[PDB]
Amino acid sequence: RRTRRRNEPPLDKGMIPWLGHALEFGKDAAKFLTRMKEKHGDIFTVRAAGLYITVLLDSNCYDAVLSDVASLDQTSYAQVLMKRIFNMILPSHNPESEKKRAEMHFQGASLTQLSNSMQNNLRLLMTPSEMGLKTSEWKKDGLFNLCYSLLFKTGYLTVFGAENNNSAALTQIYEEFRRFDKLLPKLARTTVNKEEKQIASAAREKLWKWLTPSGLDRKPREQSWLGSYVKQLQDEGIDAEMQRRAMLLQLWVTQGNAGPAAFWVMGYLLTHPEALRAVREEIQNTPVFDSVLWETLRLTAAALITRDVTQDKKICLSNGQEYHLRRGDRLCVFPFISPQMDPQIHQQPEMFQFDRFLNATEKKDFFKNGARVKYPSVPWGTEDNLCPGRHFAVHAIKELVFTILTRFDVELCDKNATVPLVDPSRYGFGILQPAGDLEIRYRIR
Ligand code: HEM
Ligand SMILES: CCCCCC/C=C/[C@@H]1[C@@H](C/C=C/CCCC(=O)O)[C@@H]2C[C@H]1N=N2
Ligand SMILES: CCCCCC/C=C/[C@@H]1[C@@H](C/C=C\CCCC(=O)O)[C@@H]2C[C@H]1N=N2
Ligand SMILES: CCCCCC/C=C\[C@@H]1[C@@H](C/C=C\CCCC(=O)O)[C@@H]2C[C@H]1N=N2
Numbered sequence: 001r002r003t004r005r006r007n008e009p010p011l012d013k014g015m016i017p018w019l020g021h022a023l024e025f026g027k028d029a030a031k032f033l034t035r036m037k038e039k040h041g042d043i044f045t046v047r048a049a050g051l052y053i054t055v056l057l058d059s060n061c062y063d064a065v066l067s068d069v070a071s072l073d074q075t076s077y078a079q080v081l082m083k084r085i086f087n088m089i090l091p092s093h094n095p096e097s098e099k100k101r102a103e104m105h106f107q108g109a110s111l112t113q114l115s116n117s118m119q120n121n122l123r124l125l126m127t128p129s130e131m132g133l134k135t136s137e138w139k140k141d142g143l144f145n146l147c148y149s150l151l152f153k154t155g156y157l158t159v160f161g162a163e164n165n166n167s168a169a170l171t172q173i174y175e176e177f178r179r180f181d182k183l184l185p186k187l188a189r190t191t192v193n194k195e196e197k198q199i200a201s202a203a204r205e206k207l208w209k210w211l212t213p214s215g216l217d218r219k220p221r222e223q224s225w226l227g228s229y230v231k232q233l234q235d236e237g238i239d240a241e242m243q244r245r246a247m248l249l250q251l252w253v254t255q256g257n258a259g260p261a262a263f264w265v266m267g268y269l270l271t272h273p274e275a276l277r278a279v280r281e282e283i284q285n286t287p288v289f290d291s292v293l294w295e296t297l298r299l300t301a302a303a304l305i306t307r308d309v310t311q312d313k314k315i316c317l318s319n320g321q322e323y324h325l326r327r328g329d330r331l332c333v334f335p336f337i338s339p340q341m342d343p344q345i346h347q348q349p350e351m352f353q354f355d356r357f358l359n360a361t362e363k364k365d366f367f368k369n370g371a372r373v374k375y376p377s378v379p380w381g382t383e384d385n386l387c388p389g390r391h392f393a394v395h396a397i398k399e400l401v402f403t404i405l406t407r408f409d410v411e412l413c414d415k416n417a418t419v420p421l422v423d424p425s426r427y428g429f430g431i432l433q434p435a436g437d438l439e440i441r442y443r444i445r
Contacts, residue, residue, distance in 0.1 A: 002052060007324050009054055010040040013047040020047030026189045028424035029304060033057070033337055042338075043315075043323055053330040054309075058317045059339045059375060065315055066333060067384045072307040077330075085187045086252075087204060088245045092236050098229060103388040105225035114158055114225075115395045121157045122399055125150055126407070128444060130167065140413065142437030143266055144420075148259035149174055151396055155255045160226055160247075164213050173210055179203045180248070181256060185425045204248060211247035226250065258393045260431040262400045264300045265293060267419040267438050268352045269401075270412055275354035280405060286398075291357040293397060294377060299352060301379030302336040304428030318371060335378030336427070344368045345376060352419075406445070413439040 004011045014020040025032050025048050033055060036044050042058035056065060066072065075095060082088045104110060124130070132139045153170045156162060165173065180203040186192050187200055221227040229250065233243050269276040275292060282288045313325045325331060341349045345368050346356065357363050357376075366373040380387040387393075404410060420434035 002047070005324065005326075007322055008045065008326070009323050010044045011052075012036060012040065012044060018047075018050050020049070022048040022189075025053075026191060029334075029427035030302065030336060030341075031424060031427075033334055037337060042317055045329070051330060052326075052328075053332055054323075054325050055332045055334065056315070057334060057338045059335060059342075059373065059378070060318050060371070061315065062333050062335065062375070062378065063383050065313075065331075066305065066307070066382045068313065071309060071311045071313045071325075072331060073310050074307055076308055077306055081188055082249065084190060085184055086245060086249045087201075088242065088249060090233065090236075090238055090242060090246070093233070093238065094236070098232060099388075101225065101228055105228075106388050106392045110225075111391055111395075114392060115399075118154055118158045118392075118396055119399055122150065122154045122396075122403060125153050125157075125170075126403055131442070133442075133444060138441045138443050140439070140441050143270070143440045144260070144263040144434050144437045146440070147263035147266060147400065148178070150400055151259035151262055152177065152255050154396065154400075155258060156251070159254050160211070160251075161221070161224065162211075162213075164216060164218065165210075169210075173207070176203050176206050176210070177251065177255070180207065181252070184252070184256075185429055188429075204245075207248045207251070208244045211251060212244045254389060257431040258396050260433055261293075261296065261300065261393070262397045263434070263438075264419070264432070265296045265397060265401055266404065266410075267434075268292070268296055268299075268354075270410065270438070270440070271418050272352055272354065275352070278354060279401075283402065283405060287358065287362065288354070289398070289401070290362075292354045293394065294357045295352060295354055297379035298340045298346070298349075298356070298377045300422075300432040301340070301377075301430070302334075302427050302432050303379075303381065303430055305333040305335075305381060307331045333382075334428075335375075339366075339368075339373055339375065340377050340379075342368065345373055404442075408442050409445050410440055410442045413441055 002011070002013070012021070014024075021032065025046065036046060036055070037057050043054065043056050045052050045054045047053075056062070078095075082090075106114070128134065132141075149171075152174050156170070156173065157165075179199060183192070183196055183200045183203075186196060192200065220230060222231045229246070230243055233246060238246075269279060269292070278288050279292060307330065309325045309327055309329045309331055311327050315323050315325060317323070339345045343349050345366055366376040375383075380390045417438060420436050420438055422432045423435045426433045
């Protein structure tokens with residue numbers, strides 16, 4: 001029987017013994033945590049599957065709290081998730097030497113080269129023939145499926161240097177990946193039913209084979225990002241089978257957000273003609289588009305930054321009140337709920353307004369009840385630990401949007417359509433994914 005100690009957050013066990021709020025937290029994390037915020041405020045502790053999870057939603061505390069890596073561990077949870085989702089183990093892996101390299105390969109001159117290759121690869125994949133325009137003037141597709149297809153294939157070819165895969169082989173990989181990706185949330189939660197466990201297992205196995213071209217004598221490039229990664233695993237005594245499985249882990253890490261983000265960007269522009277105009281005008285340093293991307297990320301970048309509490313920690317909210325986390329609990333931080341979707345910070349937060357971050361110049365002054373908000377949106381995580389793939393991802397999103405808007409005419413099938421609702425299963429996992437899709441048609445401009 002867990003009991004609240006002095007200055008611990010509000011405690012909400014739910015009614016189901018042991019299990020607590022696990023189901024509901026899992027089904028839709030935004031709805032459930034919003035519910036709890038309303039009930040309890042900016043900090044509260046929830047029971048889920050025998051564990052107690054403290055959630056911090058006071059955005060000005062995020063950095064200072066998360067900077068404390070002595071009290072807050074990413075690694076052990078990442079292990080469990082790695083096992084549950086990717087059917088993977090990496091005994092004796094040092095995550096530190098590979099965190100450093102991920103940061104170096106995706107910035108500076110290293111990023112310039114990858115971005116160049118990304119551009120070249122996107123051009124190869126946006127040929128009339130690649131766009132399915134060999135049979136008619138117009139081609140019907142879902143905007144989401146199209147945006148993911150194009151960025152997945154570009155990211156893949158660029159980051160893995162997998163030109164060994166032909167046009168139809170890339171389509172097969174993407175489609176298999178999608179079956180895996182679709183199931184990744186349930187898989188992360190251990191909520192997979194019989195059929196879904198089999199589909200997941202089947203997709204993983206095809207991908208493990210396809211992503212490592214075993215039969216080919218392709219000398220590894222050990223100075224590349226992916227090559228140095230495999231070499232490290234090999235030097236750590238990690239067997240060939242696990243190397244093969246790490247490829248699917250690295251595929252998700254690098255390809256599972258950008259295409260989806262580009263979908264939302266395009267979705268919002270196609271449904272907001274004034275935003276589309278201001279972007280199209282600009283396409284002839286891009287302050288407008290910058291704002292459009294940042295708005296899109298406010299609405300759809302929903303990582304649930306999670307940590308295990310390794311030691312008791314005293315924590316302070318903006319009002320000065322003090323709370324105690326206890327060793328063995330989890331801590332979650334959710335910038336989606338606040339600041340991104342906080343109505344006291346961004347008025348009408350459910351609405352896409354392209355200029356939200358433009359003055360009458362970048363808008364940088366934001367407030368909650370007269371308090372300065374340093375970070376009005378937090379898609380890349382916290383200032384101490386910013387996503388190392390962000391510059392690459394933004395480049396890629398720009399490149400797709402630019403290209404589509406310039407070389408294609410793209411129309412919504414239903415003239416009055418809006419962007420689909422969000423598939424709530426996605427909250428916590430990065431860029432959100434549409435419930436259904438946005439039906440479009442396109443042609444060579
Ligand atoms: C729209 C695109 C993306 C978004 C919104 C996003 C979001 C995030 C967030 C919020 C974190 C912080 C995780 C944490 O603190 O626990 C993170 C970390 C990370 N991201 Fe991304 N990401 C994106 C794209 C990418 C891409 C394209 C790559 C690879 C090229 C990538 C690689 C990584 C890696 C390796 C980390 C781990 C940092 C660490 O904890 O050591 N991400 N991402
Ligand atoms: C505890 C899980 C840590 C996972 C560390 C690997 C980072 C993965 C990033 C992901 C962002 C994280 C989303 C929520 C993961 C939970 C967390 O990092 O606390 C996706 C893929 C890549 N960029 N975007
Ligand atoms: C939502 C995220 C789910 C994907 C799982 C993320 C996996 C994260 C691993 C992290 C730590 C996991 C295991 C390290 C210990 C290896 C072991 O003993 O199995 C970092 C980055 C990657 N490898 N090291
Ligand atoms: C990685 C963040 C996205 C996950 C979406 C929410 C799902 C599961 C967990 C939440 C609790 C909900 C169910 C507990 C089952 C997870 C487990 O067995 O570890 C919070 C955040 C994560 N760990 N604690």
